[PDB]
């Protein structure tokens, strides 16, 4: 398995540390974080070296064990839509 033990720092300070398989994809991490937080996956946005993780596998982006990941949710306001 060799789980990739990462860190998930939130902009609020809390730390949802979690470990994932090597072949995980940013979509998979988003989805697991959404289950843990009970928030829709679209509202989340992961960060690494000031560079959003748009999509695709984690490895080729470079995300590795003992990494720093910032979890930043969306911010929306409006009467409708």
């Amino acid at each position: 398995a060799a789980p990739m033990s990462l860190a998930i720092h939130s902009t609020t300070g809390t730390r949802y540390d979690l470990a994932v398989p090597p072949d995980e994809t940013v979509e998979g991490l988003r989805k697991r974080l959404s289950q843990r937080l009970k928030v829709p996956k679209e509202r989340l946005a992961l960060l690494h070296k000031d560079t959003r993780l748009s999509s695709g596998k984690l490895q080729e982006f470079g995300v590795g064990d003992g990494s720093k990941l910032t979890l930043v949710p969306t911010v929306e306001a409006g009467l409708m839509s």
Binding site: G13, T14, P40, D50, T70, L71, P73, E76, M80, S81
Partner: protein, 283 residues
């Protein structure tokens, strides 16, 4: 498992000015931002500083455009001595009062899932006037009873407004008391803004302008006295109700005379005292 009703959110002076200015900047738009602070006790949620955020939207919705800014700015601010981390979000309702809508509730719900005691602050720039500022802090009631427990009257002192109730207050979200506590140096500078230099205190006026102003006001008082005469003769041949309408659209001599007399007498007293005080001080 309480969230007492004595819980308050402490907004600093700088945070308030930042929110208000950012909101007035985007008058027709629901501009928004983040707020940094700490979680001290179950009765205090202190908001220290805020920072605007890159964004784009229409008059009916607004949304963030980059999170890189959020993480980067947190790191830079932390470098120079403000480690505090985010405690909620704020936005501006320009003329709609202060309440939360569905989209607002959705974003606030994500934040609350991130951290339990997160708050939402709403400002209304155009509704705020010189003295008072229209503002309020909220949080989400779950689907469970009473949302919070009571151990004081600190919750029930505000009489929530009809518009906020109509739009969901006390049904989906509940308010929190806002405290504007300030330290000593903040107090000392807030008192020091309106203070002019010392020279302005001992400067006379262009005396020619003084005389012109005096003669102008007295030439006005002449006609005001004539009208005062023409108006005191009435008030006997006028019905007790009719008088309440005598002064609508028609100048009243009495009040204007009072105003002009106060103006003339203050201005002349101040100029005289300055002239004498100088006459002594400088040799």
């Amino acid at each position: 498992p309480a969230v007492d009703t004595a819980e308050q959110v402490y907004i600093s002076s700088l945070a308030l000015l930042k929110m208000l200015k950012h909101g007035r900047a985007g008058v027709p738009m629901e501009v928004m931002g983040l707020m940094l602070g700490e979680f001290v006790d179950d009765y205090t949620v202190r908001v220290i500083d805020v920072f605007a955020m890159p964004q784009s939207g229409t008059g009916v919705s607004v949304e963030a455009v980059d999170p890189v800014f959020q993480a980067k700015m947190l790191d830079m601010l932390k470098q120079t001595g403000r480690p505090e981390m985010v405690v909620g979000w704020y936005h501006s309702h320009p003329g709609f009062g202060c309440w939360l809508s569905g989209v607002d509730i959705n974003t606030q719900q994500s934040f609350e899932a991130l951290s339990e005691r997160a708050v939402a602050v709403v400002v209304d720039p155009i509704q705020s006037v010189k003295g008072k500022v229209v503002i309020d802090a909220f949080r989400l009631i779950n689907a469970n009873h009473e949302p919070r427990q009571t151990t004081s009257n600190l919750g029930h002192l505000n009489k929530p407004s009809i518009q906020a109730l109509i739009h969901g207050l006390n049904r989906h979200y509940y308010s929190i008391t806002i405290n504007y506590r300030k330290n000593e140096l903040e107090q000392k500078m807030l008192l020091n803004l309106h203070k002019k230099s010392w020279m302005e205190g001992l400067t006379l006026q262009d005396y020619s302008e003084h005389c012109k102003h005096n003669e102008s006001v007295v030439k006005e008082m002449l006609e005001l006295a004539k009208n005062y005469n023409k108006a005191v003769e009435e008030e006997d041949k006028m019905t007790p109700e009719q008088l309440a309408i005598k002064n609508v659209g028609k100048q009243d001599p009495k009040r204007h005379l009072e105003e002009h007399v106060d103006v003339l007498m203050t201005s002349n007293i101040v100029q005289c005292l300055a002239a004498m005080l100088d006459t002594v001080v400088f040799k």
